[PDB]
Design a protein around this ligand. Structure first.
Ligand SMILES: *[C@@H]1O[C@H](CO)[C@@H](O)[C@H](O)[C@H]1NC(C)=O
Lengths: 48, 48
């Protein structure tokens, strides 16, 4: 501080900048038919 | 709301395809041969 004053850079001209942000709030609702995935339609597999 | 396991559509017919691997005997081709021998000089062919 020279004489009680500090050197500061103060803006003399400005613009607006746009900044886009994506926030994920959802995901695909995956549904699995567990019996059809594991065994398809085979009776011996469904029994096991 | 309940996701009910609807049946898979049952196949109505069967399709089989496979290379026969071994060649055809073609017994008819040799039997249809017009130059048939006499019993005196009977011809012999082995189909293996
Ligand atoms: C501010 O900047 C813009 C673009 O750089 C210019 O058109 C405008 O004249 C400037 N204004 C001042 C006061 O410096």
């Amino acid at each position: 501080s020279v004489g009680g004053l500090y050197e500061i850079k103060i803006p003399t001209n400005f613009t607006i900048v746009g900044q886009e942000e994506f926030i994920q709030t959802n995901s695909p609702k995956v549904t699995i038919d567990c019996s059809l995935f594991v065994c398809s339609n085979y009776a011996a597999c469904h029994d096991l | 709301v309940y996701d009910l396991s609807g049946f898979t559509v049952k196949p109505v017919a069967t399709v089989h395809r496979r290379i026969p691997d071994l060649p055809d005997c073609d017994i008819d081709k040799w039997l249809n041969n017009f130059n048939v021998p006499s019993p005196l000089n009977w011809e012999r062919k082995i189909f293996s």
